[PDB]
Subunit: 387 residues, 4 copies
């Protein structure tokens, strides 16, 4: 049960309803297999369905076949997909926000028309690359070179940790066009690379602790020739599209932890009132009643925290410290809650036959992805520093 | 600065502004003295100003001179008074919610007309008595006997821990009218006692750790004769008024922890950017920036949590678990945040010349008053148990 | 390096040394594989090496080829093996403590001579069965029936969650001889079952979150005829051997969390001084220095806690609350430390190529096995209850 | 009763007993008054008694009437006195360690012969001054100027936060002899000032949140003429005596949080088995049993931690990171344990008639005095940075 004390309108309640019911039969039963195999076999198929529901270009203009909604609805879908499968939620998050939302914001009419429609329909998968083997938290120290040869740029180097890497047909890559920029930040440009471009290659998927099924791989660029027309926004003014898209990323991705915390409750609460020890349902012991209370309040507090910040964003009010704040808090709660879920199940929570362990493994990613908890604390503290 | 990302309307923002400005010059300066002396010397005068602002009967019908607003607006005022002074915030809470709100909810036309106007104006001070020396968490085991002698009841016994006790002109007291009730809960009745009634006396103020200035004492009843006309609601159907009031009490009193957390921030943030160690503002060191982030996110999370639950209550959607939830969460956050506030001040946070120590001492109350954290976890756990 | 500020004698420092060097070559390099394949291919061979070193019957009488040492030494070995591989540490614990130690304590001269030698040498593998699908924390509610037919007992029913279950050649099983015992605890007897006894079979190993490699399966008894001579201690007086063995179990198994926290440090410390971000080793940033401090102190405090308690036990002073206290505290520190390890490695900590994720998945078992954190809190609180 | 699982020898157990008994009747009863009045009326007299017991010069050479024992014993004594009174424990700590121990370590035969005997007897009270209004954590930036005029030094400036300040007959002050030293640390000299020296005066005691009764004031030097013969150790080589003293300070002062955590247990345990709610002692409810377990294990862990480190230090093995470690950990545990003590008492824990609130107020000092938790984390992290 999801008490829409969250302050959701009827339409948004309907959105959550539609998603939940759909995912309940199309994604939820596959979740264990996806994680176990580290692969989502129906990925291209699923994306098409997602596009048909209209959730892929949820924040994209109706002009390109988008739904033209806001981040609050985006987090709702994110949260519901993450509830059914953490891996797919992450993949969805890279596609819909990191990629699509970045395109609607900085792409010109041409780029949007050319790319958006297929991204929005699910025919194309999207991804965003900025992280490198030696540039994760310190993203501005990226070394992917982009040499301007006439009306082309020749990219050389590699990207790492890219979600939907080996499946993306369109990708937003950040590269150093001016490696000698006084402030390094003034030497970066964003480019729209496509699957099949000569020189652009991808490595094998990673064997992760969690989010297994969400394909992450290295991107390799060898003399990859990109036409100047594929630059997102403007040359050397890419640190901006990077940074601005990071706030929205943290905002929308906060739905991951929300869906995960929800999922753990979906299992713990019913189990606590079925499993019996010492003559009564384990859920009737104080210690267990306290567990419920804690998991429940953390999920409820984070939900309101994220929902309000998102509503405000849709109103035109977004801030780096507040976007970082919602995910920083949610991420850490998600992990602790998931840790309690396993505890409530006892031995049963410790076996892979139950998804309790999966929620934990998935949850932990969010304290790392979209910026580690440490980098987020810096973002908030610095905000105050500048006041 | 307070970001109304909380989703407050223009009016509500107006309310918070009005309160903040007023409290800043009329209560904030006195706060240290109030705590130190364990006494609010202008209480009566202050109450009439509060009444003039219309915040005493904030949730009371306009008919009796009330504002006719909701719990969200009440939490706002509770928060702002608590920000200025924890002691006075508590006193205000006992008056405006424990007493006044309970009167508007269960009092008949006569009782409301007779008591509400003076309570709303500030001429009268209200209080609510239910706790006893041996009945705090276990409130149902109260043993104040109420003998029915014709058209009167003769109260004999005592009440303990009563806020506004030695100031209340009108008090709502729960007594055991049926000490042999099958389920004890069926033997309790609420009565409206008034200052001056023969038999009814009060003990000396308590010397508490925090909330000094908020008068707490023991109520003594010796053959106090109360007219049957003074029973709140119905005879023996008092456990009910008690329980129902408890939820609204927890919901509205959650503003205390919120105002307290906001108060530590009001001091910590600017201090960290003034005190300098090792050549720079201590607020530039990572450990300090992390502190800010943690205090700030806890405050924001709790703020959205309680505001949204309050909004839902004003829509007619209240629940015991959710009312207990918001305060359980906010209360525990307030204390830790207050602990950090002292930490950030170093030696200075450990001397009484600064209010950092006060914030801690006040904050701790909320983990005990309105039900201990333990009782609140049981409320939530049981809610799930009954599901 | 291990600062033996832990008050270890030269001989004990030597034992640690011997273990560390041996394990570093023989177990550590195969640990990742063991986990990934969920199987220890060299099990039997390894056990014989362990027996050669004399660590299998470490607390067993020299008379049966045991070292004749104490629990402080046993903890050392358990810790070192756990440091190399969590799964094998658990398997070692089951064998050397749960089985062997229980045999040296309650077995008669015959049983000890007939079983101890081969358990001590590594030829045999030992296990202890008490848990059932409906009797984990509530161990007294076990329903494995033991029908006495002449000078034999007919066991019927099953056991669950048995470590070294499919490998044990000798097993200590607790069954209900008197299912109508007034206090149910008066109807339990411990029997030594052997591999190959007709009726007794096992199930397929479990697919667990962590401790993969440590074989856990279900025990099945179908009219398994056990001779009266195989009962450990006395008939119906089994609840006793069970309970007494549980304290020593929790004491010794405390080594697991110790070795796991050490292993985390072994990797995090040097990594923090190799990975560089923003122009410096990440370990030079305050937030990272704080992390080291916390992981370090938690490991150091638990170490002194467990070692001192064990020293006292070897001096004849053991208590249920102190044995439960040692592992309750250590187990919970282990998990959080393990969680910080992943965090310190960033994306690298999140891939199975690194063992950071393994430490987490292994550590969590300790808050479940040997009694959950909840059952341990009860044991301590109850001790004070009786005080 | 403290379980001497702590590995204390017969003689050390006797020291504990002696202290416990003595303090039980001579200090424990006065504790509340001391705190309330922010004054220890019979300080002078008490010191004489402490001296007679031989606990003042506990680690001082028998030659000067000291006991000639080690830090483990000194931690014991510190712990016991803190158990009786936090404020007196601190005062004792400043006298016996900060002052005395430093004198025995860096004072020459003359200085030791002249001051040690009366410091050890109790006839003199000692204090250590290094902190200043703008030099707490950043102690090296102290600005107390010491001009060398022939065979004397003229001190100008002030010290702050000095425990035993108004009572100290002899004080060890650190002052800048070389204000232009390349590394500022090379411009510090420690001096031995006495009460009555022209130019040296003290301000009024501080109104603190806790440790009330332990006199803390500001030192004022105005052309205070100190003979060259009164420098502790060597000119400009004072940062060294300062830094070396800091480790021992942290080690011994860790007894404070230990005594405080024992103190809360001394009250909470029996109270939990006397107060009854819902028909039974509150200590029979799981939530309360859990509380006992938690405060019990934290007290036990920290005890073993600090005891073992102290034993090792007596063996000649001390380290900055380990001395900082024990106090960092103990300090933070004492505060949270004290917080729980208040909780277990309910409303009773919130009044000043009970010491539960005193324990909290006292405890918090240890996360600030002897170096804040932050500076302690830096010390540990840096140690790792160095190797
Ligand atoms: C499954 C997965 C999916 C991802 N998907 C994408 C994607 O789609 N696109 C993309 O571009 N990237 C993606 N990434 C990369 C992700 O953004 C980075 O891994 C993350 O920012 C951490 O970087 P790092 O691994 O380089 O860690 P590092 O930067 O090496 O940091 C390691 C540790 O040092 C700490 N640290 C670093 N700097 C500081 C500091 N200043 N102060 C304190 N502590 C500090 C970090 O917090 C962390 O604790 C993904 C990663 C994973 C694992
Ligand atoms: C400053 C102040 C103001 C107050 N103002 C008012 C007021 O205006 N009106 C009013 O009527 N009352 C008021 N009270 C009383 C307050 O509601 C009670 O003090 C509170 O409910 C705790 O009760 P107690 O002190 O009897 O604690 P107890 O019930 O004795 O509880 C003591 C400890 O045992 C724990 N415990 C109890 N039962 C259980 C259980 N079943 N499971 C687990 N743990 C349990 C408690 O949580 C606590 O930790 C106030 C109290 C204070 C201190
Ligand atoms: C890898 C592994 C290895 C093991 N190895 C062995 C072995 O070698 N031998 C052996 O005999 N057993 C072994 N076990 C079993 C282990 O002892 C049990 O799984 C453990 O005691 C928990 O039991 P359960 O799974 O039945 O949980 P349950 O008893 O169902 O408990 C489930 C949840 O309810 C809580 N709960 C239960 N009772 C209470 C209460 N009174 N108050 C509050 N909360 C309560 C529990 O703490 C937990 O949070 C092992 C288990 C695992 C997973
Ligand atoms: C009751 C009491 C007794 C004392 N007794 C004595 C005594 O006998 N003798 C004596 O000489 N002194 C004594 N002191 C002083 C004590 O040593 C200092 O108060 C303490 O070191 C903190 O210094 P400060 O108040 O100047 O804090 P500041 O140095 O201003 O620090 C304030 C905050 O900034 C943080 N901070 C500072 N530097 C850093 C950094 N590099 N990184 C991260 N965070 C940082 C601090 O941790 C703290 O959180 C006592 C103090 C008290 C309150
Ligand atoms: C560490 C952190 C916070 C700060 O970056 P740092 O290298 O210290 O640089 P900053 O000073 O913050 O900013 C660099 C440039 O971007 C600009 N900028 C920063 N934040 C901005 C924002 N929110 N909007 C617009 N511009 C911004 C800065 O103004 C500066 O440009 P100019 O030099 O032209 O003024 C940043 O690198 C970061 O967010 N890292 C995490 C990366 C991440 O989250 N990756 C996730 C990938 S998907 S898992
Ligand atoms: C512990 C706790 C949660 C539960 O009470 P307990 O003694 O176990 O009894 P319960 O079964 O919850 O309820 C007792 C009676 O009240 C009724 N009741 C409980 N909650 C109710 C609610 N929210 N609305 C109406 N009736 C309610 C029950 O139905 C029962 O009446 P019947 O027997 O007629 O059905 C309760 O005593 C409590 O809230 N204690 C805290 C007190 C407090 O908050 N004091 C603050 C004073 S101001 S500092
Ligand atoms: C829940 C818990 C704490 C309490 O058991 P419960 O069923 O309530 O029974 P208890 O009263 O505690 O004890 C039952 C019997 O054993 C005895 N006993 C209990 N603790 C004892 C101890 N430490 N030493 C000796 N005898 C003990 C009791 O005295 C009673 O015997 P009598 O009836 O003859 O007096 C217990 O079942 C337990 O430890 N469960 C966890 C099981 C476990 O740790 N399994 C791990 C397997 S390996 S992962
Ligand atoms: C912040 C902190 C950790 C570091 O000091 P900082 O100003 O950064 O200086 P550092 O580089 O650490 O050391 C300064 C000098 O002392 C020396 N030193 C540092 N630690 C030392 C140690 N443990 N032993 C010996 N010498 C030491 C340094 O080597 C340097 O001398 P040289 O320049 O001659 O080599 C330090 O000022 C400190 O401990 N502050 C807290 C003060 C305190 O605890 N007061 C308690 C009073 S009672 S409440």
């Amino acid at each position: 049960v999801d008490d829409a004390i969250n302050g959701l309108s009827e339409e948004q309640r309907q959105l959550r309803q539609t998603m939940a019911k759909f995912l309940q039969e199309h994604l939820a039963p596959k979740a264990q297999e996806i994680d176990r195999s580290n692969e989502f076999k129906n990925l291209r198929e699923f994306w098409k369905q997602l596009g048909n529901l209209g959730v892929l270009g949820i924040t994209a203009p109706v002009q390109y076949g988008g739904s033209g909604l806001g981040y609050l609805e985006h987090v709702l879908v994110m949260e519901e997909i993450s509830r059914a499968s953490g891996a797919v939620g992450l993949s969805y998050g890279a596609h819909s926000n990191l990629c699509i939302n970045q395109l609607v914001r900085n792409g010109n009419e041409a780029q949007k028309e050319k790319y958006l429609p297929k991204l929005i329909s699910g025919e194309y998968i999207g991804a965003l690359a900025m992280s490198e083997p030696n540039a994760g938290s310190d993203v501005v120290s990226m070394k992917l070179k982009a040499e301007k040869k006439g009306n082309h740029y020749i990219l050389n180097g590699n990207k790492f940790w890219i979600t939907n890497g080996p499946d993306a047909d369109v990708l937003i890559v950040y590269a150093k066009t001016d490696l000698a920029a006084v402030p390094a930040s003034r030497g970066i440009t964003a480019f729209i690379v496509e699957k099949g471009m000569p020189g652009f290659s991808t490595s094998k998927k990673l064997d992760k602790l969690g989010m297994r099924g969400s394909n992450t791989c290295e991107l390799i660029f060898e003399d990859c020739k990109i036409p100047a027309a594929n630059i997102l926004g403007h040359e050397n003014k890419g640190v901006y599209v990077l940074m601005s898209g990071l706030d929205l990323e943290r905002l929308v991705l906060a739905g991951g932890p929300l869906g995960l915390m929800q999922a753990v409750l979906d299992h713990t609460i019913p189990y606590l009132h079925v499993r019996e020890a010492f003559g009564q349902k384990i859920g009737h012991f104080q210690l267990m009643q306290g567990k419920m209370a804690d998991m429940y309040t953390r999920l409820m507090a984070c939900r309101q925290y994220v929902y309000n910040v998102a509503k405000a964003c849709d109103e035109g009010h977004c801030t780096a410290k507040d976007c970082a704040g919602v995910i920083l808090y949610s991420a850490e709660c998600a992990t602790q809650v998931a840790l309690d879920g396993i505890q409530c199940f006892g031995g049963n929570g410790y076996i892979n036959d139950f998804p309790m362990g999966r929620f934990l493994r998935d949850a932990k990613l969010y304290e790392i992805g979209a910026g580690t908890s440490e980098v987020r604390r810096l973002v908030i503290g610095r905000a105050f520093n500048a006041d």
